[PDB]
Amino acid sequence: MKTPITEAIAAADTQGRFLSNTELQAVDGRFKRAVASMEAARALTNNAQSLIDGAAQAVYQKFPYTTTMQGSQYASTPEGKAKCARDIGYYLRMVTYCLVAGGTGPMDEYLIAGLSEINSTFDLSPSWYIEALKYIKANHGLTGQAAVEANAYIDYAINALS
Amino acid sequence: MKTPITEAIAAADTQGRFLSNTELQAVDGRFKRAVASMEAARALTNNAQSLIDGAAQAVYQKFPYTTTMQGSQYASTPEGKAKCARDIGYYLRMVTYCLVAGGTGPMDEYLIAGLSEINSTFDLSPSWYIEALKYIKANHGLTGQAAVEANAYIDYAINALS
Amino acid sequence: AASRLGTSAFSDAPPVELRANWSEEDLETVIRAVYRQVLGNDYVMASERLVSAESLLRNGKITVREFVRAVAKSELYKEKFLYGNFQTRVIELNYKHLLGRAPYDESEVIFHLDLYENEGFDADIDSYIDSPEYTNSFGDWVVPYYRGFNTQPGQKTVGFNRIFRLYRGYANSDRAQAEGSMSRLARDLATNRANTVVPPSNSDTAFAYYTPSADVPPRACLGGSFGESGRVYRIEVAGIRQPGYPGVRRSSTAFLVPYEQLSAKMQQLQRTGARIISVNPA
Amino acid sequence: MLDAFAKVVAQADARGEFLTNAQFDALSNLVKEGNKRLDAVNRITSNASTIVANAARALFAEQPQLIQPGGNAYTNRRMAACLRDMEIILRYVTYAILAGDSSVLDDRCLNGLRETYQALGTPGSSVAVAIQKMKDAAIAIANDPNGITPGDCSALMSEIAGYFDRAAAAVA
Amino acid sequence: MLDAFAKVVAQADARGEFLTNAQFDALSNLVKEGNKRLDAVNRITSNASTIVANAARALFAEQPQLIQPGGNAYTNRRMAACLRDMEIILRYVTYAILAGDSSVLDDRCLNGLRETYQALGTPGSSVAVAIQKMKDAAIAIANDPNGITPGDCSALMSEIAGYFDRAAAAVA
Amino acid sequence: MLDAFAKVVAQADARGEFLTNAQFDALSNLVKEGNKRLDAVNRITSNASTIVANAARALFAEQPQLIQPGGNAYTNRRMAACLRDMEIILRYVTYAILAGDSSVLDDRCLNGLRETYQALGTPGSSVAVAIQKMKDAAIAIANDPNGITPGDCSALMSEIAGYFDRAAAAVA
Amino acid sequence: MLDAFAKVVAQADARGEFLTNAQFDALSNLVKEGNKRLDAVNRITSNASTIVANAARALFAEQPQLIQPGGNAYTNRRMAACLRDMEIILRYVTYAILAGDSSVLDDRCLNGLRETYQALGTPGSSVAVAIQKMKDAAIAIANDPNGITPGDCSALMSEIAGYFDRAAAAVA
Amino acid sequence: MLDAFAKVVAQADARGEFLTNAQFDALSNLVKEGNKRLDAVNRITSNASTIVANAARALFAEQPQLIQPGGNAYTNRRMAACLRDMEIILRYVTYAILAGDSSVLDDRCLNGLRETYQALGTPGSSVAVAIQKMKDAAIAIANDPNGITPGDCSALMSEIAGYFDRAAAAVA
């Protein structure tokens, strides 16, 4: 994954040289920031259930047609709304992963790289996952540096979907 | 050069992408440690002459045969003693350049590259410079993280000679 | 006509594929030749050679194609050419070092540049390496050579002209050339303009003839010229130094001269010391 | 590719004398305002796409001859190339801002751009106008007095403007 | 050649629309600071000889290869030629400063100058270094705050630097 | 690459005809003095490293500005390149001696060297001085009268001088 | 300058043989229909001004972009140049009609025309349209059956059409 | 162009060292062999007409295609030009012989000549053959021992042959 530590390791590997003080400084910076990132991730996962359900309702309200229009892509049937909730949960799990990984690596490997193709084939309108992520961005309940870093990742996802 | 700032720029340039948060964090770390790096550079250059002279005497003591054996590679003549002083001065000047550049860039560009070739053709055994660098590492009289950075670059040179 | 043009002897192909792929000695030769072609005859110091690649190279885990790509994408190559030159100039250098030719038309720059802009440089080198041309002329077991001199593949005539702009001699390296640090085949490539062949220096005076058409007479006479019997011969010259009234101005330039006057003009030019590059009918 | 620190080091190496106290102080001043430089590049990179898009729509509104048939930014392929060459300039200017030195901008983008454009026949003056549009957009976005700890950053803004101006003058 | 006024008129004529109010305001701003342009040109031209002499001594001290036997700036004839061409570049740059546009500089001095030096065999890199020496000397003399009515002439000084940079990048 | 025999054959091929008796006698003279040629090339090749090293020390003692900071034989990378180039000139001259013709010397080694050094900035005259140092050293080593069966060798020594001279003049 | 007679002589001189009876017969046919040739030249030259003027009006009516601001036949100086070049082509075609061969047309007004127009920016396709307009007008005025003695002139008409077409093909 | 003395002086000036004793003795040898040089040039110039005429007769006998119709010496104008060029080569070679160096031979002759014949269409290989015929004629006329004070002149004859060969090979 595209972790800062891992990226430095790969940069040194391509040149075949032992890790110089530049890479060590970079990883030290990541360790110094990791305290805030990990506290934020713990908070988000302890409160995950509320956020996932609220986001599902948020998209059902902003786009009522999506829960009343026939089609497999729509959540009118109970199975469809369950799948919508499951996908929102995937997004939240990825945001916690990228919080603890100190970069956008996890998001890019398990999302982003591929989202366009799948959103076209399975008729998954990006707008749905834009509005849900905005709800999460507003109800995350974090404060301080945790709030800014988590919102940075969530907006990365928003700007990648659209 | 292989300067932290320049390295980040090159990493973004090879992939044709705008500067990502990872590289910006790395450069921020560089700026945060620059205060100590510049302090160390100041300290080394303020005692430069004493360090050069002491290192010269150190190698004369460790390898007495270099002050007696006849030959151009040896410092038995006064001209050779001047050459020895000049080259130890080169090494110390390069260490200060590396201290201010925050990376091994200057060392690799103005030294190391082809160090083996020159030391073989002019019959200048690397061990001489290795001992001199050890003396510099022990007498520069630094403390703290400034000391660790300076010692790291000196040892980079030592291992490169070996 | 070999010595003057510069192709001293480029008359064979060095493969490494063998039962003894190492061949105990031949592999040393192959490694040297790859360094000479990929890095543009740059003098690589012993410490900065790409030892990791050579390890796999003798082991047989990687083929010559993989070795060439490894050098091309390694920072050794990037510091010399990729980072430090205009991007189009870098495209020209890639064509010279990996495919042993010069850009035949502007579409080449379009395609490679777009790769660089979106996919990244690594993908650009990938495209050169696995293009049909590299796969055919070379074979994952054959060091790239300058096949631009030979015309067998199928190419625009201009290609010959253009390759002689990039190759300025056996000794020359693209890190160190007369017109270096700026695009060598960019203004011409957009206009599909031919280039006069500038012979590399050989134990006689050299005067690299830049040919910006910004201020030169047209290739053709575009008229009757003086109107004397016979056509109009275009004479180029580079080293005009003796008659500097404000400073001569435009030391390298061409003059369209009617046939009857050529002799006179010639001696005048020789008096200034410029060695006539070419005399082409217009 | 040399940043400010590397530029001073290389010049000092050409002379061959240890960095003097004055040079040390200068570099320390550069580091003292480094956080501002980092924030500026961060903000500009986050809005890069919008910067180039708004500047493009303005350029084609003020110079319609470009998008009229037979003009240089017509046929939708050349339009793509035009947007590409605006974002390229923005990217290399961002590199220059982070470095603190214009060497990258002058060596890998501006070095020969004018010749390429005039050989193409595409108007260099119009390219400069586009650069200026991007200049005002980026300078407004980066200096936006909202969201972060307030301070005096006029010097850094002047430097950013200097980079943009250098590009505009070098292309036209 | 086109000066600033002529450049705006020529662009407006090419598009075929009466000069718009924005262009008028721009030209009024230019004339409002015209006295500053005139003062700068006067100050640089009255110190031409000292500028070129100081820059030359510095160049030959920093790059001794030029004055070594067998180098390019040797034999006392080529030394005279080198000084003459350095002052020629300074002269066309002063013309450009007074004009407000680089058209004259790009049409007479640096126009096809790269080819000239490349054929002659002179190092163009060294010429660029010499132009840079002249740049710092001239900008210091022109921006000298003592001797005249105080004010901020920094924009014009940056423009002068831009002209010098354009020449230095076009020769090397 | 043409050797002596090949040179005569190529001229004869240009003119068609058939090898004349004079040409036969010339080649016979070449072969009857061949042992001398081989001995000379063996002696020069056996002491190649010391020839290059001694000449290099002399060059840097005579022209110290090359190895002073900021000169072209500085920074330990360019020093390696300079030693490399000296050895390469010696190697191609040795090739020429064995061949008996200077075609190899001008076809690969001197083919383009002049512009290479002109662009690098390396003083060509100093390189010529270095080649001349090597010329004296190598010719003395080959003309050493002790160690081998004595006999006339002055013609071959003059030929060696001629090769070194050709290289030195072409670089300068 | 080679007319029909000169062309026959030149080919015969290349072979080194006296003109064959067939060549004599061809030139005799040329002279026996010479009055037609010179009559056509006279009619074309008598209406030259009207031919060029009417064709110019038609070209600018068919392709208004040329005379719109910015177009290459705008600002009244380039308009004069355009009319001049149209009449130049007419003049060289008239020369070719009198001579009987296209040598003059291909040597003195068609040789480098394409490259010059390409560099200028002049649209070559538009120039071809213009010359074809002139072609129809001149053909009609020369072929008018009223006003002169009746006869057959079709071969000469085809020849003049061929020369106009040659010019159109070279410029575009 | 230079002469032998001037050539040595110029090289030594480029390197920047007073003329060494080795160079002095070389030049003294040249002057001790001076009267021979002057005699040779006097005899060649006095028989210039006969040299060129005999060589021309031989060339056209050995290569009949030149004077046949359609060949490059045909038409009696090109024949005059060919004789002129052969005499021109002889004239510049005589200049060179007196000078003692091939500087004049490369500075005002042979430079551009090679491409001149390729452009005109004249075969350069035939020109080379003609120069060789002239070489034989001139060498014989200079080396005739009868009519002049006897002595050794083989070295001078070899030098003359070298000049002739240089021209003949480099023109083809």
Ligand SMILES: CCC1=C(C)/C(=C/C2=NC(=C\c3[nH]c(/C=C4\NC(=O)[C@H](C)[C@H]4CC)c(C)c3CCC(=O)O)/C(CCC(=O)O)=C2C)NC1=O
């Ligand atoms: C970890 C990253 C990841 C993502 C992003 C992902 C997306 C994803 N969403 C899917 C389907 C789906 N997604 C929805 C979601 C919605 N229905 C609505 O009404 C809403 C407006 C919307 C939520 C915002 C529905 C109903 C399906 C089922 C459609 C089907 O089976 O055809 C499917 C097809 C398989 C399935 O039925 O679940 C995939 C692969 N899968 C992944 O592994």
Ligand SMILES: CCC1=C(C)/C(=C/C2=NC(=C\c3[nH]c(/C=C4\NC(=O)[C@H](C)[C@H]4CC)c(C)c3CCC(=O)O)/C(CCC(=O)O)=C2C)NC1=O
């Ligand atoms: C700035 C980077 C840089 C370095 C490092 C450098 C090293 C360097 N040191 C050299 C020589 C030398 N180095 C020494 C050094 C010593 N002699 C002794 O007895 C001691 C044990 C020892 C001190 C540790 C001597 C005596 C010479 C002179 C060589 C000679 O006369 O042959 C030479 C040979 C040519 C010359 O004299 O310059 C080089 C290139 N050059 C460079 O440009």
Ligand SMILES: CCC1=C(C)/C(=C/C2=NC(=C\c3[nH]c(/C=C4\NC(=O)[C@H](C)[C@H]4CC)c(C)c3CCC(=O)O)/C(CCC(=O)O)=C2C)NC1=O
């Ligand atoms: C992923 C990084 C990497 C590894 C690990 C690697 C291993 C590696 N080691 C090799 C050689 C070798 N390695 C050894 C090593 C040893 N000899 C001993 O006596 C010891 C017990 C041992 C060292 C502790 C030897 C002797 C050879 C030479 C084999 C030969 O050429 O005959 C070779 C053969 C080809 C070559 O030399 O390039 C490979 C591929 N190559 C790589 O790129």
Ligand SMILES: CCC1=C(C)/C(=C/C2=NC(=C\c3[nH]c(/C=C4\NC(=O)[C@H](C)[C@H]4CC)c(C)c3CCC(=O)O)/C(CCC(=O)O)=C2C)NC1=O
């Ligand atoms: C150093 C990095 C770099 C730059 C800058 C660069 C410039 C560059 N821009 C190009 C195209 C272009 N560039 C423009 C640019 C513009 N047109 C306008 O109307 C505007 C005024 C302006 C944008 C604001 C246009 C119209 C083309 C297409 C030209 C054509 O197809 O004829 C081309 C032609 C080849 C192609 O389209 O692929 C090059 C080489 N190339 C490079 O490698």
Ligand SMILES: CCC1=C(C)/C(=C/C2=NC(=C\c3[nH]c(/C=C4\NC(=O)[C@H](C)[C@H]4CC)c(C)c3CCC(=O)O)/C(CCC(=O)O)=C2C)NC1=O
């Ligand atoms: C096989 C025939 C052949 C030759 C001769 C040749 C010359 C040659 N010499 C070079 C460099 C060089 N050449 C020198 C030479 C010298 N500097 C001095 O002070 C001395 C006076 C002089 C030695 C006598 C130096 C210092 C460089 C390195 C410059 C650099 O890379 O920055 C370079 C390019 C830069 C590099 O090394 O990457 C080439 C191509 N190339 C060839 O293929």
Ligand SMILES: CCC1=C(C)/C(=C/C2=NC(=C\c3[nH]c(/C=C4\NC(=O)[C@H](C)[C@H]4CC)c(C)c3CCC(=O)O)/C(CCC(=O)O)=C2C)NC1=O
């Ligand atoms: C009005 C515009 C204009 C320009 C720009 C110009 C340049 C110019 N400078 C020249 C000469 C020269 N220029 C230089 C310049 C330099 N020598 C060095 O060592 C330095 C590296 C560099 C200055 C820093 C030299 C040495 C010559 C003489 C070259 C020779 O005689 O071989 C020449 C050759 C002919 C002559 O000397 O008259 C031209 C054409 N002439 C012009 O009319």
Ligand SMILES: CCC1=C(C)/C(=C/C2=NC(=C\c3[nH]c(/C=C4\NC(=O)[C@H](C)[C@H]4CC)c(C)c3CCC(=O)O)/C(CCC(=O)O)=C2C)NC1=O
């Ligand atoms: C990963 C790179 C990075 C970022 C994003 C970052 C953010 C960052 N911005 C800051 C403040 C600041 N930001 C500014 C910037 C401005 N002043 C203005 O008037 C303008 C509107 C604007 C220019 C963009 C200033 C002056 C400060 C406070 C002092 C400083 O640290 O520079 C501070 C210090 C005070 C605080 O904690 O709020 C941080 C840590 N730090 C970093 O290392």
Ligand SMILES: CCC1=C(C)/C(=C/C2=NC(=C\c3[nH]c(/C=C4\NC(=O)[C@H](C)[C@H]4CC)c(C)c3CCC(=O)O)/C(CCC(=O)O)=C2C)NC1=O
């Ligand atoms: C022969 C043509 C001509 C000249 C040369 C001229 C000079 C001139 N410059 C002036 C002002 C001035 N001169 C400056 C100049 C400067 N301020 C700075 O900080 C810099 C160091 C420097 C510019 C680089 C300023 C700021 C003013 C006042 C505002 C202005 O009029 O431009 C004034 C008016 C105030 C005064 O001095 O009485 C005059 C008359 N007037 C003329 O008709």
Ligand SMILES: CCC1=C(C)/C(=C/C2=NC(=C\c3[nH]c(/C=C4\NC(=O)[C@H](C)[C@H]4CC)c(C)c3CCC(=O)O)/C(CCC(=O)O)=C2C)NC1=O
């Ligand atoms: C490996 C291939 C090979 C080589 C290289 C070779 C060389 C070779 N050259 C020879 C002759 C010679 N060696 C010399 C040597 C000299 N006399 C002098 O006064 C000078 C100081 C010096 C010139 C460098 C001469 C003049 C001859 C010719 C006479 C003869 O052939 O015996 C001889 C016989 C006597 C001797 O050793 O000199 C050998 C073996 N033979 C071979 O099969």
Ligand SMILES: CCC1=C(C)/C(=C/C2=NC(=C\c3[nH]c(/C=C4\NC(=O)[C@H](C)[C@H]4CC)c(C)c3CCC(=O)O)/C(CCC(=O)O)=C2C)NC1=O
């Ligand atoms: C001032 C110089 C000069 C002129 C102009 C001139 C004209 C001239 N044209 C003639 C014939 C002629 N002209 C034509 C012409 C034509 N037939 C056609 O169908 C076309 C409409 C037209 C082509 C334009 C024909 C058919 C003849 C008679 C046959 C001939 O002699 O060519 C004749 C002989 C019969 C006659 O009196 O009409 C003269 C004298 N003679 C001169 O000395």
Ligand SMILES: CCC1=C(C)/C(=C/C2=NC(=C\c3[nH]c(/C=C4\NC(=O)[C@H](C)[C@H]4CC)c(C)c3CCC(=O)O)/C(CCC(=O)O)=C2C)NC1=O
């Ligand atoms: C002072 C230095 C100098 C030289 C050398 C020189 C040569 C020279 N010879 C020429 C012509 C010519 N040269 C020849 C020569 C030859 N025809 C043959 O069959 C032979 C193979 C060959 C003689 C050996 C011919 C035939 C022409 C005329 C070409 C033409 O009119 O088309 C021309 C073309 C212009 C002209 O007619 O003069 C030049 C420039 N001019 C000079 O100023």
Ligand SMILES: CCC1=C(C)/C(=C/C2=NC(=C\c3[nH]c(/C=C4\NC(=O)[C@H](C)[C@H]4CC)c(C)c3CCC(=O)O)/C(CCC(=O)O)=C2C)NC1=O
């Ligand atoms: C006005 C100009 C001028 C001329 C021309 C001149 C000729 C001249 N040629 C001379 C000798 C000579 N001339 C020759 C000439 C030759 N020997 C040969 O075997 C060849 C066939 C031929 C030359 C290729 C030789 C060998 C000598 C005596 C040695 C010498 O010149 O040094 C001498 C000295 C003895 C004598 O009078 O013969 C003079 C004065 N003196 C002059 O002042």
